[PDB]
Design a protein around this ligand. Structure first.
Ligand SMILES: CCOc1c(Cl)cc(N2CCCCC2)cc1NC(=O)c1cc(C)c(OCCN)c(C)c1
Length: 247
């Protein structure tokens, strides 16, 4: 997250921190996620497409810090890693960039809700806020494009939803942005998602409810004029999500 503020898990109790273990015993941070039901985290396929081995992954919930323990945090293995079959990437765009991680504690259980671990609601079919609406993002992603390490403390910021019309102009993204995507940016280009933020939530307060409007997907750089963050339009993927989450 370029700009914005540091935060704690209690402010974003649905955010999942997803790591990869390596041969040798090192663990790295992969991407964020959102808890959508006690057994299911939802994230981005491009985070996992090169390494689809569910065994390699660790999911934390209730976690505020990158490399240390937070009180009340829970550790999960990935029982089922489900990638969208029509995923693909172009120069810039990722398409159908959505994934489900079915989770389980070492004792065989799904998430137990607490003050620091809660689910985030899904939107209804083709039901998004109007452009100009403020929404929040959360992540351990880079704080500046030049960094090579991620922040140790979770972050958030508030960005504004951008119309498809503005997003698909030539100097923005042309036809690279589709209807199954959503753009959001700072009007002054000062805050943004950035590498490492992928897979995490774009949350919009919709009709008196905290709603998973987006999943961090792609962009051209971070906080660049005329280059908004691009997010998966979760409201266009409910038959996909329901289909894989029923069993
Ligand atoms: C086309 C590359 O896609 C990919 C692909 Cl295909 C793979 C990866 N990662 C591979 C290593 C393990 C984590 C996933 C990672 C990216 N993207 C980025 O590094 C990235 C992501 C975002 C969200 C960014 O911010 C844009 C939002 N304004 C930036 C600048 C880079």
């Amino acid at each position: 997250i370029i700009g914005g503020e540091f935060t704690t898990i209690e402010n974003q109790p649905w955010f999942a921190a997803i790591y990869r273990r390596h041969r040798g015993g090192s663990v790295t941070y992969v991407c964020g996620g959102s808890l959508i039901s006690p057994c299911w985290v939802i994230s981005a396929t491009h985070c996992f497409i090169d390494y689809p081995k569910k065994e390699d992954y660790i999911v934390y919930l209730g976690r505020s810090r990158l490399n240390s323990n937070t009180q009340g945090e829970m550790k999960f293995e990935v029982e089922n890693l489900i990638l969208h079959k029509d995923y693909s990437a172009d120069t810039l765009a990722h398409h159908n960039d959505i994934a489900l991680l079915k989770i389980r504690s070492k004792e065989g259980r799904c998430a137990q809700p607490s003050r620091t671990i809660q689910t985030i609601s899904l939107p209804s079919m083709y039901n998004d806020p109007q452009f100009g609406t403020s929404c929040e993002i959360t992540g351990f992603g880079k704080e500046n494009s030049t960094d090579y390490l991620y922040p140790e403390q979770l972050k958030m910021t508030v960005v504004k939803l951008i119309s498809h019309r503005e997003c698909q102009q030539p100097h923005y993204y042309g036809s690279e942005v589709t209807t199954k995507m959503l753009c959001a940016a700072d009007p002054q280009w000062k805050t943004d998602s950035c590498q490492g933020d992928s897979g995490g939530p774009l949350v919009c307060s919709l009709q008196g409810r905290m709603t998973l409007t987006g999943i961090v997907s792609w962009g051209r750089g971070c906080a660049l004029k005329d280059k908004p963050g691009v997010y998966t339009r979760v409201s266009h993927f409910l038959p996909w999500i329901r289909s894989h989450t029923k069993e």
